[PDB]
Design a protein around this ligand. Sequence first.
Ligand SMILES: Cc1cc2nc3c(=O)[nH]c(=O)nc-3n(C[C@H](O)[C@H](O)[C@H](O)COP(=O)(O)OP(=O)(O)OC[C@H]3O[C@@H](n4cnc5c(N)ncnc54)[C@H](O)[C@@H]3O)c2cc1C
Ligand SMILES: Nc1nc2c(c(=O)[nH]1)N[C@@H](CNc1ccc(C(=O)N[C@@H](CCC(=O)O)C(=O)O)cc1)CN2
Ligand SMILES: [Cl-]
Lengths: 133, 666
Amino acid sequence: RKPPKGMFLSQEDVEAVSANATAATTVLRQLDMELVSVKRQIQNIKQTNSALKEKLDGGIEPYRLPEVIQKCNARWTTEEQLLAVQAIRKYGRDFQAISDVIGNKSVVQVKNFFVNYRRRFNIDEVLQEWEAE
Amino acid sequence: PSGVEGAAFQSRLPHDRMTSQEAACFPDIISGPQQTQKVFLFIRNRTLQLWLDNPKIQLTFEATLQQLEAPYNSDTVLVHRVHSYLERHGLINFGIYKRIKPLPTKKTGKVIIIGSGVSGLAAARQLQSFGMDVTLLEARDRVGGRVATFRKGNYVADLGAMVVTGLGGNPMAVVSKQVNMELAKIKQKCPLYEANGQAVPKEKDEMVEQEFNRLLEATSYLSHQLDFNVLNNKPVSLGQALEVVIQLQEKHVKDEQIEHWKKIVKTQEELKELLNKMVNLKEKIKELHQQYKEASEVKPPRDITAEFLVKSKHRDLTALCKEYDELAETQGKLEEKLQELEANPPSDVYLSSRDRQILDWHFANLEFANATPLSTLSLKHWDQDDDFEFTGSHLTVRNGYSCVPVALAEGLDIKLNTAVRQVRYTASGCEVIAVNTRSTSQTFIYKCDAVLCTLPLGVLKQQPPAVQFVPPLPEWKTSAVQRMGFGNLNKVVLCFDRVFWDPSVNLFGHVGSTTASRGELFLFWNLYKAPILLALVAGEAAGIMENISDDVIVGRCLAILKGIFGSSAVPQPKETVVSRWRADPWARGSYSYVAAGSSGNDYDLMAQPITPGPSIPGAPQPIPRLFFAGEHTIRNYPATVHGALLSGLREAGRIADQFLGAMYTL
Ligand SMILES: Cc1cc2nc3c(=O)[nH]c(=O)nc-3n(C[C@H](O)[C@H](O)[C@H](O)COP(=O)(O)OP(=O)(O)OC[C@H]3O[C@@H](n4cnc5c(N)ncnc54)[C@H](O)[C@@H]3O)c2cc1C
Ligand SMILES: Nc1nc2c(c(=O)[nH]1)N[C@@H](CNc1ccc(C(=O)N[C@@H](CCC(=O)O)C(=O)O)cc1)CN2
Ligand SMILES: [Cl-]
């Protein structure tokens, strides 16, 4: 019904190996060559990656800033309003970023701010300027 | 199988169905009601049972009838018909059995039988029993032909046929009850020793054997599923097919290696893209940190844009550090995924050169069984006879197989040292010209009604001919002769005066160094209570070794054995014999095989008798006059002793039917 398990035999394979007196030797050598060709390619990338790794040696340890946790507040101080306005100018819609920048205002509080002060801080006009960047 | 069904099975007959042969003789019955057919079958099976139960004595019609219960004994004609039918076709009353009815004093018809090997002897006994005058012409100074034993004192070793391949359905089972052959089973345990003389661990042995079987199964797939049976208008050989299969497995090993290393490169590449991102990201982070410091060093108080700058840069820096930690997480995953692949390469080769040598031992073994190199066997038909194999264990004749022909020859008229040179067959009769082997000038002429030719296929192939047929045989026959294969294989008998090997080890192998020499003394048998070792020469080695002197052959044997049992151990042999079946002018090989370009049908063609043309123009179609038997003439059991025996039984029945006429076909 079918070839014994693990034995591989297609119509296509057979015809190629039997087409002429040394078709097999040709097929096998052409594969030895493809095989050697791909291990050169491995050695090369292994060497490429060894160099790249040694460039990242030390990682980003000297660049970490021990980050503070601090709780929320639903009150807007003048300081915070101005921070937000500038944050919107830099980051646009990105509520998460704006929240992070202000530090003490959740995402929702920020989203609300957008509506409540839309008029007073010409928020639409500011946003169109973020869009030109 | 048991009872009356056991009898059918033991006679190679279907118990519940009538054969083609039976149809021809009992057309009235096979074309009639099912019930009648069942009556016939029972009578047939029962008659066979009575004979098989006691084959040391002639089973007569009267004896048969007396042991059938009603209503089966209520048709005496039918019983008599069945009896004569079985008797004529050799299914009962064959071999050597004490007869009840003495032989007809006046004989009818004259037959010359060429050759006194088992086919010839079996046919002669039958013809004599049927009342014909029979003479056998044998070239050798002995009977039995390719069944040749060797004797010295109590030491006994077969140079020809040696194995009884299972008793279930084998006619030799009947012969073994008639003649006192001492049959002995063959332990299938067979350790192997590599060329260096060290034993093969039974880890490898099993693995390689399994692969060998898998490869055979593979060639069968190539043959039946892909119809790979013709290559460049030439028939494909088993050898060729195996080479293709092996090459494809080697190809697959390389295909897997490639895909494995390609998965490594592909991953290696993802890594380098990620590392590049990381390096660039580290630069950005390093730069932002510097800016964030410059910003944080503007001491307060500070206007809101300055404050915004510090807070803003801080956020951007943390965000980027989060990106870097994610990429570092991915780096550890890819790095480990590589240590995994680097540690798990796919297998290195299809076969280690050691593996290939052991594999070649198995091929040599197959070359020995078929008495020919694998490159000569038909891929499509080499195993055409496998479905007819007998059941039970293989056995050897402890007291020498020659006991069979020697016994079968008792009471027959055999002319030894008489080599047939020419066979003339005409409308009116035949004449056979033969010479005395011991002085060729002495000539003999034998006239007969019919000639039964059991000359070996090897002899029939001889060019120029050893035996001339006048008129020449027709092309349909000669072409069959040219197409079929006739192999070769040899034995080396080593007699010592003391044992030095393991006496419970029945047989063991020597693994050759190269493929070319795989059949050279690859197997050794330790078969008797006596201290004798038999070495086998198979495949391409068989033919070549025949050109080498005994001393050089024996030297090689001793060299091998010294390597296995120790140089100190193995003493010099007391006596040695080397067979050379190819050079033997009366055999010219060992036995037939289905060569590429041939088929089983050729075996049938070898069997078909020849009928000469009319002597007088316008005269009626003659009788057939030239008949053939032999190992090479029986499609289902070729190349064996039982095959030869059956061929003789067949021709005896056909000849007797032709010249004495059937009683039993009304
Ligand atoms: C090495 C070897 C091992 C074997 N092992 C086994 C085995 O283990 N099991 C098994 O079942 N079978 C085996 N066989 C096969 C078996 O021996 C044969 O199939 C069988 O014995 C052949 O019987 P035959 O009558 O057809 O051939 P033969 O015995 O060849 O009968 C032919 C006779 O014709 C004679 N003859 C030839 N030329 C002339 C002439 N010109 N004039 C007169 N007579 C002539 C011959 O010398 C011979 O006596 C083996 C064969 C060989 C060669
Ligand atoms: N059936 C079977 N039939 C056969 C052969 C065979 O080889 N096995 N080979 C040919 C006859 N010659 C021999 C030579 C050697 C052996 C022999 O010694 N064979 C192995 C059996 C091989 C098997 O497993 O089939 C054994 O040790 O019993 C048997 C027949 C033709 N018929
Ligand atoms: Cl001889």
